[PDB]
């Protein structure tokens, strides 16, 4: 995660606007909806039968909240992503056993949700800046896989 100073302005200024309550749920939900196999890990979340049941499930909106917490956090620790996620890495890695590829799928949805909410403000440059971030996190989380 290098990030030039004007890529910094992009990412930063945008983040401070994100509804940090709803957005986190919008992404985890579309994940289960668009990439079904991921549901395998949240069976204990209740009925995940329709995109409606999923977009409405409280466990979902209550989990994405946390998930976005890990991003905000990461976003203010780009210097060291590995450290920040060592605990989470270990967890998703030698405990849940999530294929690291799903971290990239989650980052990309998160990116779609951000494009969804800011429509035109989310320009290509702001996206390119954010794609680097999603890649950084996705790799820190999969570090325990070595």
């Amino acid at each position: 995660v290098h990030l030039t100073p004007e890529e910094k302005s992009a990412v930063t200024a945008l983040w401070g606007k994100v509804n940090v309550d709803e957005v986190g749920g919008e992404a985890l939900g579309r994940l289960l909806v668009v990439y079904p196999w991921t549901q395998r890990f949240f069976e204990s979340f209740g009925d995940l039968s329709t995109p409606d049941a999923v977009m409405g499930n409280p466990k979902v909106k209550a989990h994405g909240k946390k998930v976005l917490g890990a991003f905000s956090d990461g976003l203010a620790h780009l210097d060291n992503l590995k450290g920040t996620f060592a605990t989470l890495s270990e967890l998703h890695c030698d405990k849940l056993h999530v294929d690291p590829e799903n971290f990239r799928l989650l980052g990309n949805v998160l990116v779609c949700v951000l494009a969804h909410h800011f429509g035109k403000e989310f320009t290509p440059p702001v996206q390119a800046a954010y794609q680097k971030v999603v890649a950084g996190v996705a790799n820190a989380l999969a570090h325990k896989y070595h």
Partner: protein, 141 residues
């Protein structure tokens, strides 16, 4: 495969894309080049700078190939038959690069159609672009 619910969702959101078709097509392109540099290697004779009329003309070209797909969905293979040879035989495009464009294509749509881009339709397009990708990389398998 694509379910009827899917091809109805695809046909609607694309309907809504309307005449901005060729425009959104040049926007996905520009997005991919900036986010995934490694893709620029296929467009040397292109001036990939922000205003490139070349990038523009290609975007129109990309939109149209996608429009040809929606209006013949139940039979893409035969329809994109030709673009298959071109991308797989002549250009040898890495298959990974199709997943990167399909993405910038969903990010372009989502940033233009806030009302339609619902999770359900979001999933339908993704299958559509996935199927379009498989056809173009068919002449590999």
């Amino acid at each position: 495969v694509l379910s009827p619910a899917d091809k109805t969702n695809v046909k609607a959101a694309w309907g809504k894309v309307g005449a901005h078709a060729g425009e959104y097509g040049a926007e996905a392109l520009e997005r991919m080049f900036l986010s995934f540099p490694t893709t620029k290697t296929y467009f040397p004779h292109f001036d990939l700078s922000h205003g490139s009329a070349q990038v523009k003309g290609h975007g129109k070209k990309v939109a149209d190939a996608l429009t040809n797909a929606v209006a013949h969905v139940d039979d893409m293979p035969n329809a994109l038959s030709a673009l298959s040879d071109l991308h797989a035989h002549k250009l040898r495009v890495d298959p990974v690069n199709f997943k990167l464009l399909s993405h910038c294509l969903l990010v372009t749509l989502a940033a233009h159609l806030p009302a339609e881009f619902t999770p359900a339709v979001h999933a339908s397009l993704d299958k559509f672009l996935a199927s379009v990708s498989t056809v173009l990389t068919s002449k590999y398998r």
